[model samples]
Target: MNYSTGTDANTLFVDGERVLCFHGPLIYEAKVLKTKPDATPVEYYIHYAGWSKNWDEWVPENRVLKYNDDNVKRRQELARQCGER
Candidate 1:
């Protein structure tokens, strides 16, 4: 569900789902740990899929993207590639 409109809280993403989060210059797959839709600007606590808690952080709504099958595949590929490196 897209929540481009801030008022559509009911359409917000759920916890424990995979998502794509925008970092400095990339979008990485992450697991949603928590969500605060009522918070100012809205925020989500996420843990990067192949990374540790040190990489976990809270990001704003605009920085998150709903996960899809393609994204899941990409994440697995990336994780595999990272393991090789």
Candidate 2:
């Protein structure tokens, strides 16, 4: 997912269809109010509530994609490449 400040949490696109606010992390733990058809090929939206140290305040920061295996692997690869070091 990518960081987009222009996106409205109340409005979103999924498979090109507009959808209600929801969560889906194709990447990191983040709130995804919506997704596009091409989201599968793309990272989609991810959790982004600016900078914070407290964890509870970021409860919604949980990764959207519940499946951990694939996501974990991808995260590891990105870390290896220094994408999120």
Candidate 3:
């Protein structure tokens, strides 16, 4: 189980699973519609929850995060700070 080397610490779980997509000043719930691993650094197409389909678009891998507990905590934190100004 030597899964390192060039592998990214944050791996993506493609479609069939929801993800946290960073947009604006927060991370929105989203689902991956497609992927472009061959697109150099890789990119993913996602549709944000409750967002219009027209708003769906491709995003770099760095723009997404696993839909896990820690990620959700981060999401909540970001949301809280969105209006800290």
Candidate 4:
């Protein structure tokens, strides 16, 4: 069963038998797509459920997003989108 909730924890059911638990915000439930031996730090593709319905692209995060009032515009947008405002 697939879930659509922000508060939902990261988990996955594989092959309708195996259950996998993840502890990262970026990865929901993904399987091994491709592997490269020469790729530094093991760069590969993964198929995982994302936050937005229209977003399924594999974009690695170089910098973590932070929540702070110092960035007025960013904080305002974040609060508005998260329904905290």
**TM-score, each model?**
0.56, 0.26, 0.62, 0.26
Candidate order by lDDT, highest to lowest?
A: 3, 1, 2, 4
Deviation from native of the Cα of residue 85 in model 1, angstroms: 18
Clashing pairs in 2: 13-35, 14-35, 15-36, 15-37, 25-64, 29-63, 30-47
Predicted structure 1, TM vs. truth:
0.56
- Tell me how far the alpha carbon of residue 78 in candidate 4 is from the true structure, in angstroms, after superposition: 22
lDDT of 2 by residue, 7-58 (tens): 3433233323311222432334434433443423333443344534243222
lDDT of 1: 0.70
Tens digit per residue, CA lDDT, model 1, 1-85: 5457445554367666677775643356578887776656676788877668776688777778877887777667767766753
Question: Order of all candidates by TM-score, from best down to worst?
Answer: 3, 1, 2, 4
| Alpha-carbon lDDT of model 3 | 0.71
Model 4 weakest 10-residue run by lDDT: 12-21
**RMSD list, candidates in order:** 6.2, 13.4, 5.6, 13.0
lDDT of 1 at 51: 69
lDDT of 3 by residue, 19-76 (tens): 8767576667888876666545776788877778788688777777777899898877
Which 10 successive residues of model 1 have the least lDDT summed?
2-11
| Per-residue lDDT value at 20 in model 4 | 20
Q: Tell me the spans in candidate 4 whose CA falls farther than 4 Å from its real position.
A: 1-27, 49-85
Shift in Å, residue 66, candidate 1: 0.9
Model 2, CA-based lDDT: 0.39
Clashing pairs in 3: none
